[PDB]
Structure 1
Amino acid sequence: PMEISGTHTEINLDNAIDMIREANSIIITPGYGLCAAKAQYPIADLVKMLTEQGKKVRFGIHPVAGRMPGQLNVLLAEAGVPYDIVLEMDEINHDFPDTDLVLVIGANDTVNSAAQEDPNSIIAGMPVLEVWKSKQVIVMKRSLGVGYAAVDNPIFYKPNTAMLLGDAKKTCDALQAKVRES
């Protein structure tokens, strides 16, 4: 007779819009989920608009994000994301504690805090994008399901993390449309 509970929070599009417009510095950490949904385009256009409003918007790429090395770099460039704002993990990782908002779009293992928090984790020690150190995290995926490493992500239950559930393309399209309504 054993039980363990986990509490996560879910936000709506309007709340996500509020957090986005409230933020001045934004880091986006894309993963396989963005690749699967082909969501590079709506996020590229969103970034473009947010940049035009004076916001600091950049991408943080894990060396092993997606299914191929450098896959996210290719897809973001295909969407026309300026190369200057596409940074690698080792360059951008130190900026997390000083960032207002992190949009985790279709990423999980690459942003899994258990790598540093759970000494008995199968991914313990593995370098990750330290997204949880930012003021606010929005995790954009279809649910609280696992990634490739088939492991639970403790960031889903962190106070500063909000889940924005749904297909990456669908969510990014909606956020792109609402921000355009200005």
Structure 2
Amino acid sequence: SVKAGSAEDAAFIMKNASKVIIVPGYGMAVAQAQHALREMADVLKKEGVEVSYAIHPVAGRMPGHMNVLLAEANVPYDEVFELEEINSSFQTADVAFVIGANDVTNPAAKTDPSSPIYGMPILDVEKAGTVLFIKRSMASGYAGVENELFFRNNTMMLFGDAKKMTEQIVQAMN
């Protein structure tokens, strides 16, 4: 029931965007994909597209997990935003580029009261025109629950390693 996708498909979607919000997560750290991620941002920004990063306070497995890796890949601080200052921008976003995140985006956090992630504020990636999830399989995140967004109409799954996918996505672009 999931609308799967490939590197070529994903590269059209972002190149024809006025605005793209990158949502990094644990899987991005596991793949060590931040260099190739910021690479993709340089190509997007060169076309005239607006690029930002949405950092959930508990993305990854430690505080500042996404920050240190983004800083290593040399992404400037002015492009990186915390949940509370970027959540409203997802309405104006053509695409939410979710790279290795999952629990952080899951809407069951405010829908399902019996969910383990209920009450945790999330990034509202569903408000974007389209959502792109990069992850290897249909496996859950840390919390061990499924994400409704996976089988949403406006979502596209990019099944593979986050570094390899992003690297390949950069190739389809120019």
Structure of greater Rg = 1
Q: Taking structure 2 as the reference length, what is the TM-score of the superposition?
A: 0.97
1:19 to 4, 13, 17: 13
Aligned to 1:88: 82
Hey, which bits of structure 1, 4+ residues long, moved more than 3 A?
A: none
Give secondary structure in 2 for the equivalent of 1:125. Answer: coil
RMSD, aligned CA? 0.9
How far apart are the structure 2 equivalents of 1:94 and 1:8? 27
Give a deviation string over 1:110-166, Cα, whole Å, max 9, x none: 111111221221211210011011110010101111011111111101111110110
Amino acid across the alignment from 1:87 = F
Q: Which residue of 2 aligns with 1:164?
A: 158
- 1:50 paired to 2:44: yes
Report what 1:40 is aligned to: 34
What number of residue pairs does the alignment pair up? 174
In 2, the alpha carbon distance for the partners of 1:80 and 1:131 equals: 24
The correspondence for 1:8, drawn from 2, 8, 14, is 2
- State, as a whole percentage, how many aligned pairs show the same letter: 46
CA drift at 1:29: 0.5
TM-score for both structures, normalised by structure 1? 0.93
Give the counterpart letter for 1:42 in structure 2.
A
What letter corresponds to residue 69 of structure 2 in structure 1?
A: L
Letter in 2 for 1:51: K
Long gaps (5+) in structure 1: 1-6
Give me the whole-angstrom Cα distance separating, in 1, the residues matched to 2:50 and 2:137: 28
1:106 & 1:117 partners in 2: Cα distance?
22
> For 1:1-182, what aligned pairs fall within 5 Å after superposition?
7-180=1-174
- Corresponding letter in the other structure for 1:167: D
Distance across 2 between alignment mates of 1:132 and 1:166: 21
Gaps of 5+ in 2: none
1:67 alignment partner, SS class: coil
